Design a protein around this nucleic acid. Structure first.
Ligand SMILES: [Mg+2]
Ligand SMILES: [Mg+2]
Ligand SMILES: [Mg+2]
Ligand SMILES: [Mg+2]
Ligand SMILES: [Mg+2]
Ligand SMILES: [Mg+2]
Ligand SMILES: [Mg+2]
Ligand SMILES: [Mg+2]
Ligand SMILES: [Mg+2]
Ligand SMILES: [Mg+2]
Ligand SMILES: [Mg+2]
Ligand SMILES: [Mg+2]
Ligand SMILES: [Mg+2]
Ligand SMILES: [Mg+2]
Ligand SMILES: [Mg+2]
Ligand SMILES: [Mg+2]
Ligand SMILES: [Mg+2]
Ligand SMILES: [Mg+2]
Ligand SMILES: [Mg+2]
Ligand SMILES: [Mg+2]
Ligand SMILES: [Mg+2]
Ligand SMILES: [Mg+2]
Ligand SMILES: [Mg+2]
Ligand SMILES: [Mg+2]
Ligand SMILES: [Mg+2]
Ligand SMILES: [Mg+2]
Ligand SMILES: [Mg+2]
Ligand SMILES: [Mg+2]
Ligand SMILES: [Mg+2]
Ligand SMILES: [Mg+2]
Ligand SMILES: [Mg+2]
Ligand SMILES: [Mg+2]
Ligand SMILES: [Mg+2]
Ligand SMILES: [Mg+2]
Ligand SMILES: [Mg+2]
Ligand SMILES: [Mg+2]
Ligand SMILES: [Mg+2]
Ligand SMILES: [Mg+2]
Ligand SMILES: [Mg+2]
Ligand SMILES: [Mg+2]
Ligand SMILES: [Mg+2]
Ligand SMILES: [Mg+2]
Ligand SMILES: [Mg+2]
Ligand SMILES: [Mg+2]
Ligand SMILES: [Mg+2]
Ligand SMILES: [Mg+2]
Ligand SMILES: [Mg+2]
Ligand SMILES: [Mg+2]
Ligand SMILES: [Mg+2]
Ligand SMILES: [Mg+2]
Ligand SMILES: [Mg+2]
Ligand SMILES: [Mg+2]
Ligand SMILES: [Mg+2]
Lengths: 169, 211, 122, 159, 296
RNA sequence: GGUUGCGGCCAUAUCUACCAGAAAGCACCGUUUCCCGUCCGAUCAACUGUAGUUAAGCUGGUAAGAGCCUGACCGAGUAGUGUAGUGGGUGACCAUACGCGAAACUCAGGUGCUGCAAUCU
RNA sequence: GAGAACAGAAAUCUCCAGUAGAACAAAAGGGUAAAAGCCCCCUUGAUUUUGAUUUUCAGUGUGAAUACAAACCAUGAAAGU
RNA sequence: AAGCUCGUAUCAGUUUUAUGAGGUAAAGCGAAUGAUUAGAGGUUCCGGGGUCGAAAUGACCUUGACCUAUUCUCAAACUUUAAAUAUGUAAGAAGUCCUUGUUACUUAAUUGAACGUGGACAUUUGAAUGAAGAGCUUUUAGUGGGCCAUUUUUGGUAAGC
């Protein structure tokens, strides 16, 4: 019984885990920039491993958060690449979902060898309306069980829209 | 090397167990505490006999294991590996120290030397469970184990069923009633508190108001 | 005061005195604190002289105010010097003294046997 | 060697009254203190500033000075064979109004009350506290209360 | 509630619940303590807070003093009261907040006696000023602005209510760096802009900014403004007139009887469900044991 | 009685799972010109009260529910303890006398009370 | 815990749970959750004057600390600190 | 030792009453933390084995560790609870209550705060027991190796240590 329990997309965050800092990262950053239109954010390394050749606070990654119609736009632009085919996995038991795509040129974006080719992790966080209770300052509360996102309920929404796919157990 | 057991018979000091501070304790000479058919069911052994201490002394882990093997051996060699469940209810967490002999008594705080268990008066040391057909045997076993200890300890037949806190009649009532529920080595009982559904999935024989 | 008695049980012997015991105590060993200055009463005039304000003018008046705890018991009692009794004549009746009366001893609260003991010591 | 710091040995004394941690409720900041009031001293481990020394824990004193964030409490400390006057500047967070005189005040008001009634009617003051007097006579009945004769029980073991 | 996350008896037992007004994300105690607490050497003088809260599009302005048994309200003025003085729509706007501030200012001043005296600033030119004390006279009423959990941003309606109370006559110690029109870098305030916000220059500018670019959104947004034949030009005067009306009468008279509380209590107890009897649930579980465990 | 703003005590108030909630109020909710803040008007700022919902928040009720609060000759006058003896015992330890006296356990009951102001079929 | 190209036990991204199981130079013990911890912004109160008070105690000194008085300042819308 | 000022005044190695403070004893552990015996039931795309396996994010046994409800046993530097004995303050005339002056402090405010003037209520004037009284000053001796017993208790196998 839902006249307002209609599943919107909260945000879509794109993430390039460029394993090191430098030119490669400022390039993946410029890609994210002309994929979002918003200045992306850089991520520093938490600790140091040295097998991955990284260092604490190395600024080894970039991401960008996009919400609304623009997010639906890029979401579809990537769904095409993945042929509208996902798996029973890839979905959080909490309702959200995401995929990954190497070959970032499949998103319309041209080649431009002065930047190279890069991969990207796509993560879509979904939520019904009134999710503001958990994110506001005053009276911050928890949404009812029946009202928050579910994994089966989200895959059902995903299939209904774009009829894309489920594909396995 | 091992100092005579008389040097630590009494509880002269406050519990000094292995800890963040002692931290260099030797390994307890007694490591196995359940012997025999410890996987048996409560119904398998209703009879229970205890070896209870009649003093406030300390028992060395050495003597503890020595008596354990003595008793267990007699019991198996005249009863059979799975004819009894021998549990020892005394774990020796007390660490005994010693001052190793060009100096004198200056700063003479010893190093761990051994372990021992502090037993009160009336505290059960050995708890053996069998079926009444074996009482004489297990009793003689505990009697032979007695000789391996310092200080008076007496044997006593339990009024309870095996290793359960219920006297035989109360246990019979509850089980022939339908509130008992077997478990690997022990049993569980039906409570009147909590979830009714989670209380009905368990103990389903009951609620028929009959045996 | 009962707590006081409890606090000193192993050093004293005490009980419930009878009219006879109190009368013989005041008559033979009754002395009054007069300027401290313990004085043998020996005349109702002394009692009247000091316990007169409270309405006590005779040795028997004093005895009555004592036995029947009276509205002036504190004064009537603090006026009497602590009776100096002699060791019991017939003996203590028990082998060891510093054991409660219940444990075949002498200290503690013998309820009425205090009279026999006092009479033997007065 | 030995350690004799200002807060030495106060682990449990200053402990937090388990399941009563965190910020202190505002009633303790709303309470008012006037010179001459009798207050109790209990340190509040949460407020490190202006806390009393361990010796004054559980001690009662009188207020001699009122300031913005604290109160001045006078305490008589026994040093040797004599008592000395010690003045503590304690934060309101470690003070509590004392009820050591509540009984006295209540009894004084009740005393004057029935004293007024006393002079109203034939005067019979009867207003001084007296310790517990011994019980008086009473008659115990056996109607429906016949006695149960009891005897000692033999030795059992129960284990 | 994934079974891998359920809480244990020990967790719940050893768990310490916070204060109710905190569990309800309503009171910032770390702030309440420092606002309420009073200098121990005055010992009865209450610290009066000017609580200003914002319901969804309704302003609340109360003047409270704390009490060991519960905060007592001295004066209360709800922005929904503006119709009386001359404002009908959007009583959430900066000008509405300023209106309520001035309202309570004069209301409390009259409830006290400082009505003729401490009339505040009338010709509001949008200047930065505080209600100064009178030579050889009672000092003005002093209250401290309680914004609750509001996030202090430069130019907010909470500070608009502040400006209203201060202009009304209340003594509210305050700075000017969070008043609309404050230049971030350069240390100069624009009183023309502040006066604008006090009257509606931004809402009025929006009205005539949408009136000739998109009548399709002005259609519904501002619908009432048209439903009552009134454009941007007018706004300054509606507010100014409201100011005169409030300064003339701060009275607060309440709502009419309207189906009195005992009647309300009845028509609501109808929906109020009261707990069941222990014997009731005893039989309610006995019936379940019979209907479930009794072999159907 | 409901509701809100501000509260006092800070679980009888919390946790888990369901179900119900008129009126009003809260709310979620629409918009980005302006003040303001963000990687993102999600948060924060502002505007509208218009376009939309009780789905959630919030309120209440249900559960041999967990937790929590209260009570009891429930255990227990037990454990421990102040005081006494030229008491027992090789000792370890122990019994007795005059007093004080737990915790666990068990069972029973309960699941927020209430201050100020405004508002409501 | 469940989720996202290379990516693996360990890189970065998201959500859910989370009474503190973290962090607060250091020893340990207290204490702390719209903080006392983490990110940020603005600062020099780690300042000036001479007294009282607490601990150690002889109620000497020193060390350390507390609460005021008189200044001049910092921060915040503010009460405040 | 000298005294001195006073004397039913105050005074107390004691009880009672009212009101506090404490973390030892005991207790607890199917409560936190840290130890510790035993099974039983779950769980992996996620430890190693290992039959079928071409493999499987594959089924299956295996042993492991983790989760659940139980189980035996413990703590000077562990603990929800929590004594006994010891311990703080109060039990009036320096009391209680009212009427309403001073100020530079404080209040929105003759608001409060502190100190005062006038007035009302006497020894049942505010528990017990005791008191060869209470309080005050100056100066100076010797001493500053200690040892023993019940009980609590540290080190040590112990000791007339
Ligand atoms: Mg709906
Ligand atoms: Mg690399
Ligand atoms: Mg001993
Ligand atoms: Mg020792
Ligand atoms: Mg040697
Ligand atoms: Mg030598
Ligand atoms: Mg050493
Ligand atoms: Mg015993
Ligand atoms: Mg033996
Ligand atoms: Mg048990
Ligand atoms: Mg003869
Ligand atoms: Mg003779
Ligand atoms: Mg003899
Ligand atoms: Mg004779
Ligand atoms: Mg030390
Ligand atoms: Mg907390
Ligand atoms: Mg400091
Ligand atoms: Mg459990
Ligand atoms: Mg704040
Ligand atoms: Mg409605
Ligand atoms: Mg906003
Ligand atoms: Mg509903
Ligand atoms: Mg709400
Ligand atoms: Mg509820
Ligand atoms: Mg329950
Ligand atoms: Mg004893
Ligand atoms: Mg003896
Ligand atoms: Mg620390
Ligand atoms: Mg410095
Ligand atoms: Mg020293
Ligand atoms: Mg000196
Ligand atoms: Mg010197
Ligand atoms: Mg000094
Ligand atoms: Mg100094
Ligand atoms: Mg007491
Ligand atoms: Mg302890
Ligand atoms: Mg213990
Ligand atoms: Mg316990
Ligand atoms: Mg444990
Ligand atoms: Mg084949
Ligand atoms: Mg023990
Ligand atoms: Mg005392
Ligand atoms: Mg005393
Ligand atoms: Mg007296
Ligand atoms: Mg006398
Ligand atoms: Mg005299
Ligand atoms: Mg001398
Ligand atoms: Mg000398
Ligand atoms: Mg010397
Ligand atoms: Mg000398
Ligand atoms: Mg010498
Ligand atoms: Mg002696
Ligand atoms: Mg010696």
């Amino acid at each position: 019984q839902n006249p307002m329990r209609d599943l919107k997309i909260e945000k879509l965050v794109l993430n390039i885990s460029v394993g090191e800092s430098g030119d490669r990262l400022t390039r993946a950053s410029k890609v994210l920039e002309q994929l979002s239109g918003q200045t992306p954010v850089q991520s520093k390394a938490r600790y140091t491993v040295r097998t991955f050749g990284i260092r604490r606070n190395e600024k080894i990654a970039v991401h960008v958060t996009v919400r609304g119609p623009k997010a639906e736009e890029i979401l579809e632009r990537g769904l095409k690449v993945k042929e509208y085919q996902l798996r029973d996995r890839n979905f959080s038991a909490t309702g959200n979902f995401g995929f990954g795509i190497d070959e970032h040129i499949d998103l319309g974006i041209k080649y431009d060898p002065s930047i190279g080719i890069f991969g990207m992790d796509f993560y879509v966080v979904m939520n019904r309306p009134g999710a503001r209770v958990t994110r506001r300052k005053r009276c911050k509360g928890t949404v009812g069980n029946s009202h928050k996102t579910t994994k089966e309920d989200t895959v059902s929404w995903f299939k209904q829209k774009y009829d894309a796919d489920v594909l396995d157990k | 090397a091992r100092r005579p057991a008389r040097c630590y018979r009494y509880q002269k000091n406050k519990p000094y167990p292995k800890s963040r501070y002692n931290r260099a304790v030797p390994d307890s000479k007694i490591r196995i505490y359940d012997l025999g058919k410890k996987k048996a069911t409560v119904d398998e052994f209703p009879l229970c006999v205890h070896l209870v201490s009649n003093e406030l002394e300390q028992l060395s882990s050495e003597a503890l294991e020595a008596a354990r093997i003595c008793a267990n051996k007699y019991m198996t060699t005249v009863s059979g590996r799975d004819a009894f469940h021998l549990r020892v209810r005394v774990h020796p967490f007390h660490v005994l120290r010693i001052n190793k002999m060009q100096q004198g008594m200056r700063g003479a705080w010893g190093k761990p030397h051994g372990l021992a268990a502090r037993v009160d008066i009336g505290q059960i040391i050995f708890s053996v469970r069998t079926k009444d057909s074996n009482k004489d045997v297990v009793v003689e076993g505990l009697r032979r184990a007695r000789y391996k200890f310092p200080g008076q300890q007496k044997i006593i037949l339990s009024k309870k069923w095996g290793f359960t806190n219920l006297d035989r009649p109360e246990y019979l009532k509850k089980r022939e009633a339908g509130e008992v529920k077997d478990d690997g080595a022990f049993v569980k009982f039906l409570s009147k508190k909590g979830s009714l559904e989670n209380n009905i999935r368990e103990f389903p024989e009951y609620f028929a108001a009959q045996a | 005061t009962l707590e006081l008695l409890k606090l000193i049980e192993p050093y004293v012997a005490y009980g419930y005195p009878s009219y006879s015991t109190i009368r013989q105590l005041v008559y033979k060993r009754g002395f009054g604190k007069i300027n401290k200055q313990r004085v043998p009463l020996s005349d109702n005039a002394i009692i009247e002289a000091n316990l007169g304000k409270y309405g006590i003018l005779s040795i028997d008046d004093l005895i009555h105010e004592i036995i029947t705890v009276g509205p002036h018991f504190k004064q009537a009692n603090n006026f009497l010097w602590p009776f100096k009794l002699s060791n019991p004549s017939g003996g203590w009746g028990v082998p060891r003294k510093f054991k409660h009366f219940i444990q075949g001893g002498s200290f503690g609260n013998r309820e009425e046997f205090i009279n026999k003991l006092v009479k033997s010591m007065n | 060697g030995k350690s004799h710091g200002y807060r030495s040995r106060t682990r449990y004394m200053f402990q937090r009254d388990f399941r009563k941690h965190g910020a202190v409720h505002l009633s303790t900041y709303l309470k008012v203190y006037k010179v001459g009031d009798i207050v109790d001293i209990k340190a509040n481990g949460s407020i490190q500033k202006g806390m009393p020394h361990k010796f004054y824990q559980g001690k009662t004193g009188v207020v001699y000075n009122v300031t913005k964030s604290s109160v001045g409490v006078i305490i008589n400390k026994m040093v040797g064979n004599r008592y000395l006057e010690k003045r503590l500047n304690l934060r309101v967070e470690h003070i509590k109004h004392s009820k050591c005189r509540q009984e006295f005040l209540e009894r004084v008001k009740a005393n004057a009350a029935k004293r007024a009634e006393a002079k109203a009617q034939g005067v019979a003051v009867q207003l001084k506290r007296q310790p517990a007097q011994p019980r008086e006579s009473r008659i115990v009945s056996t109607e429906g209360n016949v006695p149960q004769t009891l005897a000692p029980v033999p030795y059992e073991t129960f284990i | 509630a994934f079974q891998k996350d359920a809480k244990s008896s020990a967790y719940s037992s050893r768990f310490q619940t916070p204060f109710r007004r905190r569990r309800e994300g309503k009171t910032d105690y770390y702030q309440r303590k420092r606002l309420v607490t009073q200098h121990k050497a005055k010992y009865n003088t209450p610290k009066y807070r000017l609580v200003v809260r914002f319901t969804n599009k309704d302003i609340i302005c109360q003047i409270i003093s704390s009490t060991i048994t519960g905060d007592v309200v001295l004066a209360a003025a709800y922005s929904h009261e503006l119709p009386r003085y001359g404002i009908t729509h959007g009583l959430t706007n900066w000008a509405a907040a300023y209106a309520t501030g001035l309202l309570i200012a004069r209301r409390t001043l009259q409830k006290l006696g400082l009505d003729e005296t401490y009339k505040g600033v009338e010709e509001v030119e949008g200047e930065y000023e505080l209600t100064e004390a009178v030579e050889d006279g009672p000092r003005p009423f002093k209250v401290f602005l309680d914004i609750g959990l509001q996030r202090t941003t430069t130019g907010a309606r909470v500070f608009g209510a502040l400006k209203g109370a201060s202009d009304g006559g209340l003594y509210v110690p305050h700075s000017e760096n969070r008043f609309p029109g404050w230049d971030f870098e350069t240390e100069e305030i624009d009183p023309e802009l502040l006066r604008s916000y006090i009257f509606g220059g931004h809402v009025s500018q929006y009205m005539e900014e949408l009136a000739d670019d998109d009548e399709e959104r002005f259609s519904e947004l501002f619908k009432g403004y048209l439903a009552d034949d009134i454009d941007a030009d007018s706004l300054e005067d509606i507010y100014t007139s409201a100011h005169e009306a409030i300064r003339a009468d701060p009275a607060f008279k309440p709502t009419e009887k309207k189906f009195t509380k005992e009647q309300y209590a009845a028509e609501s107890k109808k929906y109020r469900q009261t707990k069941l009897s222990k014997e009731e649930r005893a039989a309610r579980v006995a019936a379940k044991i019979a209907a479930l465990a009794g072999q159907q």
